Structure formats: C-alpha cells, structure tokens
Design a protein around this ligand. Structure first.
Ligand SMILES: Cc1cc2nc3c(=O)[nH]c(=O)nc-3n(C[C@H](O)[C@H](O)[C@H](O)COP(=O)(O)O)c2cc1C
Ligand SMILES: Cc1cc(Nc2cc(F)c(C(F)(F)F)c(F)c2)n2nc(C(F)(F)F)nc2n1
Ligand SMILES: O=C(O)c1cc(=O)[nH]c(=O)[nH]1
Length: 355
C-alpha cells in the first residue's frame, strides 16, 4: 500500500519517466528495496525451455536493458529475468522526451528507440557475475537475453550475430526482438531466423541457449499462421507474445495518449491474451509461449496461462504498483489455482483449449 498510492503516484509527479526508470534500476541493483519473503510453492514451478523456473513470473525486457540489476530483480521475487534489448553498438535512441505515462489508463507509451549501452558493456557486466548466475540458474532462476539491432543497420543478421556470439554463452535463453514499434514476409523471416539458429548452434560447447522470437500484438491472421509455420519448420524453441501495440483503445483518459509509440499496460492485456490463444492453437500446444502484456495480477497471469502460456512476464505494472506487484501476482495466482481446481500451475497451461 505504501508503494501503491503513496510512493508511485508521488514519484510520478516528481520524476520524469526516464529519470524514474534510471533511479529504479539503480535502487534495484543496490538492493535498497526490501526483499521479497514470499516463498514460492512447488505448485508454481515450471519446467520448460530446458530449465526449471521456480515461479512463472518474469520481468520483461526493457527494464534491465543493460544487465545492471539482475540479482536485485530475483530478490524482488521474479522467477526469471530478461535483459535487454541489447544492441551491438552503444546508441542514444530517440530524442527526449520519449516515454509517456498514462496513469488513468495504467498504461505507458514509449518510443525509446533502443537506447542501449551496447554489447561490450553488457558482456563485461554479465561475465563478471557469470558464476553467480550459474548458481541462480540451478536454483530455478534463469536468465534471458534479448537482442536488438542498431538504427543504422542495414544488415540485421550481422547485428543479431554479434549478439548471439557475444551474449549467447551467458544466456539461458535468447530472444530475437523483431517487434519494436519504434525501429517482411515468411521467406525473409525464415532466412533471418535460420541464420540466428545457425549462430546459436555454432556456440562454443556452451550447452546452449533456447532461442525465442518475440512478436507484435498487431499482426495479420496469415502472419500468425506463417510464424507458427516457421517455428515448427525451424524448431524454434519458443515464442514471446507480445510486445507493445501501436493502437490506442477507446477510453484512454491520459493527456499524453496522442503520442506516437508502443502502448503497454492494462490496455494491452486482452489483446495480448488473444494473441497467445491463437498461437497455442496454431502450434498445437507444441511450442512454448511466454505471455506478456498487461499482467498486474494473478488472474491476469492465469488467463495467459490458460490461453497457453507456460510463463508470463510483466513490466508496466511496476511503474504503477511498485515491487509489491510481483508478490501479488504469485500469491493471487496460487490462490486461484487452488480455488479453481488446479493442482499445479502446469496443469493450467492450455486449459482453455482443453474444454
Ligand atoms: C519503457 C519500455 C521499454 C521497453 N523496452 C523493450 C525492449 O527493449 N525490448 C523488448 O523486447 N521489449 C521492450 N518493451 C516491451 C516489454 O517487454 C513488454 O513486451 C510490453 O511492455 C508488455 O508488457 P507490460 O504490459 O507488462 O509492460 C518495453 C516496454 C516498455 C514499456
Ligand atoms: C513513477 C515512475 C516509476 C518508474 N519506475 C519505477 C519503478 C519502480 F519499481 C521504482 C522503485 F524503486 F520504487 F521500486 C521506482 F522508483 C520507479 N517509471 N518507469 C518509467 C518508464 F520510463 F519506464 F516508463 N516511468 C516511471 N515512472
Ligand atoms: O526501445 C524501444 O523503443 C522499445 C523496444 C521494444 O521492443 N518495445 C518497446 O516498446 N520499445
């Protein structure tokens, strides 16, 4: 409660979004935040992507862009952390201002345009902690790395390749982020993905990261069939559904609603869940999905899980509710699984399809 209508709305008044984000990352890294004490139950454990996840709630890409706060994030209760997106070379991103809060809608619009410290900086930081991560991973706390491309780049495959070569040895999973709204066709995707998988395969007697593709919520019905077709044809390990949306739904109260960019938070929630449900159907329940978009409660997580997600992520909820939201989600999720007749979270995955 202290976070929810004392600290967050107040920070909102005081701090511009970028300043607030930067502060959040630093406070999280430094461990100033009180630690989560909620204990995950066996009921929340998920095994997927070649790893065990102690709980199914992860932090989505975009919070820890540069891998500065990974340990602190696990301490807040996240089951898994995704770093990035990381671009090969450092870049500024778009002109400020570039992130807008719509508190009325519990939503954010962003056009960051991939401000990243770049691969070498993030490699150095992650390497220094690689041993610690190996222990965390073993304890059910995996690490994902999300790869982006520079604004310049004509050659996407080359940018992705630097990323896979550089960070793939540090990753439990890798994500190709082809969905930023702020920076194709089957064949073109197929080529790129094959090149990425080929870079992954070449890795170094690392035993090797799973490769996922992160998609937009704004796709055509054929693209969804296409993406499913490729994933199955290429043996892509997973899908992350979804990134932010370019739409503005009816009823936004926020002044900044007209701003160009990707919308996240509650207004995205149902569109994202719908997108998961299709993808599970098209892929026959055979390809794991990490569901993201507007999760801020246990029910929100459960809906995504029932729709077909094996895991879920959140980011935007933190902006409005603070760190307690991670525990709220897990606590609510456990309570709902018990009420609703599931012995474990795993039993819920794809339940919508079952009926
Ligand atoms: C400010 C901001 C920055 C983001 N940056 C990235 C990014 O760099 N890479 C990425 O894949 N997704 C990024 N995302 C998308 C989130 O990972 C997530 O897909 C989306 O926000 C939906 O989840 P949420 O509603 O819980 O925020 C960003 C989102 C926000 C709000
Ligand atoms: C008020 C506010 C908060 C914030 N994140 C945020 C999120 C947090 F969890 C904290 C902390 F440290 F209290 F737990 C915090 F200090 C800031 N963002 N992050 C954004 C941005 F830019 F990412 F959209 N705007 C924000 N506005
Ligand atoms: O850097 C960004 O602007 C960004 C990337 C992304 O993948 N998603 C998003 O909403 N913003």
């Amino acid at each position: 409660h202290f976070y929810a209508e004392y600290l967050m709305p107040g920070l909102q008044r005081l701090l511009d979004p970028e300043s607030a984000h930067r502060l959040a990352v630093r406070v999280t890294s430094l461990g100033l935040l009180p630690r989560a004490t909620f204990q995950d139950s066996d009921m929340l454990e998920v095994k997927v992507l070649g790893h065990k996840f102690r709980n199914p709630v992860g932090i989505a890409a975009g919070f820890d862009k540069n891998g500065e706060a990974v340990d602190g994030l696990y301490k807040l209760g996240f089951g898994f952390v995704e770093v990035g997106s990381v671009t090969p070379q450092p870049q500024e991103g778009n002109p400020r201002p570039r992130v807008f809060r719509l508190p009325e809608d519990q939503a954010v619009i962003n056009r960051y345009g991939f401000n990243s410290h770049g691969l070498s900086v993030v490699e150095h930081r992650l390497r220094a902690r690689q041993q610690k991560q190996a222990q965390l991973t073993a304890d059910g706390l995996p690490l994902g790395i999300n790869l982006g491309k520079n604004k310049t780049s004509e050659d996407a495959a080359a940018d992705y390749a630097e990323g896979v070569r550089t960070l793939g040895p540090l990753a439990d999973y890798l994500v190709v982020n082809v969905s930023s709204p702020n920076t194709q066709g089957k064949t073109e995707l197929r080529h790129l993905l094959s090149k990425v998988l080929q870079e992954r395969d070449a890795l170094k007697g690392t035993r090797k990261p799973a490769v996922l593709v992160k998609i937009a919520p704004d796709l055509t019905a054929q693209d969804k069939e296409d993406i499913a077709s490729v994933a199955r044809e290429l043996g892509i390990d997973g899908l992350i559904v979804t990134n932010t949306t370019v739409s503005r739904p009816v009823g936004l109260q926020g002044a900044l609603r007209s701003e160009t960019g990707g919308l996240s938070g509650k207004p995205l929630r149902d569109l994202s869940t719908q997108t998961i449900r299709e993808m599970y159907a098209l892929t026959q329940g055979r390809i794991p999905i990490i569901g993201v978009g507007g999760v801020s409660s246990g029910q929100d997580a459960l809906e995504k899980i029932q729709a077909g997600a094996s895991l879920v992520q959140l980011y935007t909820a933190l902006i409005f509710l603070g760190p307690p939201v991670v525990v709220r989600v897990k606590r609510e999720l456990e309570a709902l699984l018990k009420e609703r007749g599931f012995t474990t979270v795993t039993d819920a995955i794809g339940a919508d399809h079952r009926r």
